[PDB]
């Protein structure tokens, strides 16, 4: 189910090439014939509007799109009733006999799980969790527990739920704590890192992504090649340059990801160019990272520009440590940036107190701002006194 959500996401906003939606149209048209995408197929028009969302032959009659294959027809209408019969009506008579005759426990619980998976493709989340609750009482070992974490996860990836998914996953894992192997534990931890993209936790998104193995593949929830982009972009976003050398640039699993798929261009281009202190070739590497990774991915679109901005401020800070005073013919000449545009970069970064630096107008000498004898023993030393005083006087003033 993830292969359709990744390709059809290009139908939202494409400012570069139309062929990106044309190549993705072949994947959407092929999957809707074998299986019924109607809950997600209709959700495309109800998600984003005034781009591809206005074209429909059923709910609202309009044409706005670069692709005409998103409109309903008589073929998908007949296939919608076929899924409600073979997957539901035919199984409903078989599962009813097992409930009355009382044959087995785990064998019958698997029938309710397979039935609940059919409602995910149909789009009914009420009966999907209802049949799961009946099989939850019959489940004992971890064999039936693996499909429980996916049912809640299908709301986030498929139904696009950023709220009720995180609360339900924490309740199931807390009631019965097993975890299986590391790949089963990733299914909980992968969403925790992805959920940080919606609430904008910044570096807290890659906390559980870096520790997760590169062999994690959820199929319908997520694919093998796509999950490699989340750990590569957020991994460099969180871990500093010192951690990039012993973890990112040299890894057994990570280096095998970019060799198979060349669409990453993160753990290599953004690293090796930084290790060589070359910012001239480092600038165009952000194009393939933004255009070919962040844009086509769904959850990576929540931030977008927020990614490459903090990556530039991070690499500009490393240049300030190698020289006390910089020159105008160094940053603003060989690296490709321009005096007018480069001044807008650090122009808003300095008052944010994210990076301290001095930019010159006439002579064009960039000076590195250092606390010198201040460091962390001046402002950060006295901040902990009053910072903890509020929480210390919280229960002291009001007693109980």
């Amino acid at each position: 189910n993830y292969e359709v959500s990744e390709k059809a996401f290009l139908l939202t906003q494409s400012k570069v090439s139309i062929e990106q939606r044309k190549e993705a149209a072949e994947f959407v048209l092929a999957k809707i014939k074998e299986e019924e995408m109607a809950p997600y197929y209709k959700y495309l028009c109800e998600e984003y509007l005034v781009n591809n969302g206005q074209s429909d032959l059923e709910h609202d009659e309009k044409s706005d799109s670069l692709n005409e294959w998103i409109k309903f027809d008589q073929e998908l209408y007949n296939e919608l009733c076929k899924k409600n019969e073979s997957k539901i009506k035919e199984l409903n008579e078989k599962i009813q006999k097992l409930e009355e005759d009382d044959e087995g426990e785990l064998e019958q619980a698997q029938a309710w799980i397979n039935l609940g998976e059919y409602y995910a493709q149909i789009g009914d989340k009420d009966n999907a969790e209802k049949t799961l609750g009946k099989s939850l009482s019959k489940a004992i070992s971890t064999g039936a527990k693996i499909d429980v974490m996916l049912t809640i996860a299908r709301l986030g990836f498929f139904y696009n739920d950023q709220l009720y998914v995180k609360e339900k996953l924490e309740a199931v894992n807390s009631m019965i704590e097993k975890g299986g192997d590391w790949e089963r534990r990733n299914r909980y931890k992968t969403y925790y890192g992805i959920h940080c993209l919606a609430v904008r936790n910044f570096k807290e998104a890659a906390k559980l992504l870096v520790d997760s193995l590169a062999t994690f593949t959820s199929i319908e929830l997520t694919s093998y090649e796509s999950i490699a982009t989340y750990a590569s972009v957020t991994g460099l976003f969180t871990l500093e340059r010192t951690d990039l050398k012993s973890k990112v640039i040299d890894s057994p699993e990570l280096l095998s990801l970019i060799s198979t798929t060349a669409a990453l261009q993160s753990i290599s281009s953004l690293t090796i160019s930084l290790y060589a202190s070359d910012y001239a070739s480092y600038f165009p590497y952000l194009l393939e990272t933004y255009a070919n990774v962040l844009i086509p991915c769904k959850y990576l679109n929540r931030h977008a520009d927020f990614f490459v901005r903090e990556m530039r401020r991070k690499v500009y800070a490393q240049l300030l440590e190698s020289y006390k005073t910089l020159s105008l013919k160094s940053m603003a000449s060989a690296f490709g940036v321009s005096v007018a545009f480069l001044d807008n970069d650090l122009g808003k970064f300095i008052p944010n107190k994210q990076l301290n630096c001095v930019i010159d107008r006439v002579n064009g000498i960039v000076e590195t701002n250092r606390p010198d004898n201040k460091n962390a023993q001046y402002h950060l030393l006295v901040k902990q006194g009053d910072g903890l005083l509020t929480k210390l006087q919280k229960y002291g003033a009001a007693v109980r």
Partner: peptide
């Protein structure tokens, strides 16, 4: 938490970033 979330920037998207590639050959 200050000058961060909703205000954002509203620049550095495409036109400004794509212009910096032409400056390399103009030197």
């Amino acid at each position: 938490e200050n000058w961060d979330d909703v205000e954002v920037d509203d620049d550095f998207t495409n036109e400004l970033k794509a212009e910096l590639d032409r400056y390399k050959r103009e030197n």
